[PDB]
Symmetry: C2
């Protein structure tokens, strides 16, 4: 359904206002169209009416089409893409690059083919969009993004749960009609514990990331009683909810069910650590499942940030079992205390118990079993799972496949992912292995609540406009 | 059919170029959207996405719809327009309630919205997209469209605009012969007023350029032939025309001369062979060497030239004459339309110009049986022996003419629009000269050009969003 009165406060503006934007923004090619879908599309749309860059556009289109393609049609989509653009006078044979990257792709894998067009497409042809209409309309789409979207603009009625900080909800964006889990906090209780620093650190990195295994924050505002942060909804429940209490006499999960979730996690942590950031506490109950069936990772008090120029960070906190060996003694540890935690999680996924313990001891024996004891496996495991879990559960962090080379490119090779080609999961087209059932104050604080509230977080907002049709139905020409 | 290579030299530009345009142009409201259809439409299009000025837009739309409406549905379209806007559901809220009383003929109703629509709401278009695209449509208009851009094959020629595929009569002149007669002044005066007028009873000039051998001027298409072609040589044993056939053409002429003379300008030479017929069946007037201009502050102009018979009485002696030497010429034409001969003479009788002048001045018109009385009572007006008793240009328009009995059937609206089924559908050089040829060639004449883009779809298919 759709609302009108809140959709009415949203109009397409004039041009004497988009001049304060012109100077203060400095989006280099990369930060704009390639990442911002309203940019993407508007610039797509610039290459659509301008006839000279059809071949380069469709080129890139069909690269995104092959990127996500299935696994018995990749040979065919390859022979489709090779016959259209590459070789003896193709009919959409473009003429702006020379002929050095034509040689590059002939072996397979067409990833370097893509970056060859990107580099150029962002230089000589890119000049025009800027000095053309489509871009300007973006400024005006952009203009309305830089606006104050307060408590008025969202609704409350059904609540997720209660840990302590406040009350967690699902909320609909009124004008458009999009749903969002918006976490709400009793302000007085927040200042009551100096819990400022764990939350903002948690906020600062939410808006900076868009990985569909990480709760993507859309908005940030101040009501009066509470502070809020819209993130991409998750219903049914968490993974413990499923592991232990979905099917009782058949405890735990099957093989492709746990695999599918483990992979979605691998890429969430990749994004986590690509920006130099730790999760520390990683477990099933700290992982959710949406109505669509694509999981994420949740609850981010334990979300410490690593700075720039420094190497490591120290401490003592987390969850007994999902701490690493080098985390319990209290030494300098890399991100793989998460990957160690994941190993324990993956076990408790397909075990119905903590890996060292028995199902359902003090923290000293749990620490002594975290460090020393190896994993004694039963019959239920397939060999690919056993050969892989021995990597995560190593007693030191240099032999455990942690964050290496900048991405999990060494992890993604590992035997357990043969069926799963490492593309489709990052997009969102794979049928997940279980679909669910649906139906008085000082100055220092009020100056912070408005600092905290940066109104909008840009890109999920952009996505909301494009997916809901809001972009489509006010980007009108006739 | 359509061409590609010439349609390829026509692209939508960037924005760092439309800055020399910003300062040097000064289009006040009237000169832009209300008259320029690409402005009209783009601004229409601005009021289409902006939801607050739907009622004002459709208001004006339905005024243009009623303006042209037929004559047994005007009572109904009135009761349709009165029930929609005059608590109506598209009741607009920007004007007060003084013009609501006025209309209770809705012409003053229209100018009430126009006045306002061009003031408070008009500010935005300017500072909005739709206008900018106009700047870029405008930019490409200010371009050199030379000899390359047009074709010749059938002859004065007919020429097709290659890229789009639109037809045009483009009049071409041997330059050396032009300078050979100091015939500069009669042509430029003739050019200067062609581009300044768009009346569909006047050859509307679209372009102006220089080839090398010739200078040219594209004007709006007419096929079959001229009126003599029909009068004398359409149906041989039934010479001339019927009654509603000649009437229909005579009326179209009345309004062409109205436009001719509204701007203080004379045709002098008016005749059937100097009147054409298009494929659609709406006529115009043609060949404008004899197209002298009257200035400002002066009263009259003198001379000796034209065509023996279609000169006036006061034109042959060589005195000061008003426009009605045309209207006198028209009387002779209307006769030769429905007679198959010159009014005074006998058909094809080759008398000299002295007896033709003596019969132009003295002799009255001896009518036969074929005429209906409304035609006889009217032609006696045009063929009077002096210009003060002949119904010439009076009051600023032919409002005294339009009353006359011969036009009962014809209500004086539909012919000006273009919806009436016409009564016959068809089947070495110095510096002073090369500096003038490029002055002469102002490249484009804006509005018929604009029309070409909108009618051919050229506007429609490069004004694309998706």
């Amino acid at each position: 359904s759709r609302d009108r009165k809140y959709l009415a406060r949203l109009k397409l503006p004039p041009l004497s206002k988009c001049e304060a934007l012109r100077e203060s923004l400095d989006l280099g090619f990369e930060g704009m169209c390639l990442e911002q879908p309203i940019g993407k599309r508007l610039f797509q749309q610039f290459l659509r009416t301008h006839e000279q860059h059809g071949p380069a556009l469709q080129l890139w289109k069909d690269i995104e089409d092959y990127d996500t393609a299935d696994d018995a049609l990749r040979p065919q989509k390859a022979q489709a893409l090779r016959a259209a653009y590459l070789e003896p006078q193709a009919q959409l044979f473009c003429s702006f690059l020379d002929a050095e990257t034509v040689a590059r792709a002939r072996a397979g894998l067409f990833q370097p083919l893509l970056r060859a067009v990107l580099a150029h497409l962002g230089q000589a042809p890119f000049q025009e969009f800027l000095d053309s209409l489509y871009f300007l309309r973006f400024l005006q789409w952009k203009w309305l993004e830089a606006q104050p979207m307060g408590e008025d603009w969202f609704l409350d009625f059904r609540v997720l749960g209660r840990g302590g900080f406040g009350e967690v909800f699902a909320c609909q964006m009124k004008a458009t009609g999009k749903l969002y889990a918006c976490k709400k906090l009793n302000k007085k209780r927040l200042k009551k514990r100096k819990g400022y620093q764990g939350a903002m650190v948690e906020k600062k990195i939410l808006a900076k990331v868009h990985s569909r295994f990480i709760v993507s924050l859309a908005y940030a505002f101040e009501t009066k009683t509470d502070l809020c942060l819209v993130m991409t909804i998750m219903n049914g429940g968490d993974i413990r909810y499923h592991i232990y209490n979905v099917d009782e006499d058949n405890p735990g999960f099957q093989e492709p069910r746990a695999i599918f979730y483990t992979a979605q996690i691998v890429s969430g942590l990749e994004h986590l650590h690509q920006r130099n950031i730790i999760y520390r506490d990683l477990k099933p109950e700290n992982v959710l499942l949406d109505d669509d069936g694509n999981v994420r990772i949740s609850d981010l008090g334990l979300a410490v940030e690593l700075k720039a120029g420094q190497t490591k960070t120290k401490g003592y906190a987390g969850t007994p079992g999902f701490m690493a060996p080098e985390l319990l003694l209290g030494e300098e540890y890399d991100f793989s205390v998460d990957y160690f935690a994941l190993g324990v999680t993956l076990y408790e996924m397909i075990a119905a118990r903590g890996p060292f313990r028995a199902r359902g001891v003090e923290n000293k024996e749990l620490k002594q079993r975290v460090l020393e004891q190896a994993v004694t496996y039963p019959d239920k495991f397939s060999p690919a799972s056993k050969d892989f879990c021995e990597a995560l559960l190593q007693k030191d962090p240099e032999k455990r496949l942690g964050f290496r080379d900048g991405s999990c490119d060494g992890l993604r090779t590992h035997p357990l992912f043969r069926d799963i080609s490492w593309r489709q999961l990052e997009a969102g087209m794979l049928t997940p292995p279980f679909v669910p059932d649906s139906r008085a104050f000082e100055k220092a604080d009020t100056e912070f609540f408005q600092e905290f509230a940066s109104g909008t977080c840009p890109i999920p907002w952009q996505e909301e406009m494009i997916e809901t049709g809001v972009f489509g139905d006010l980007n009108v020409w006739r």
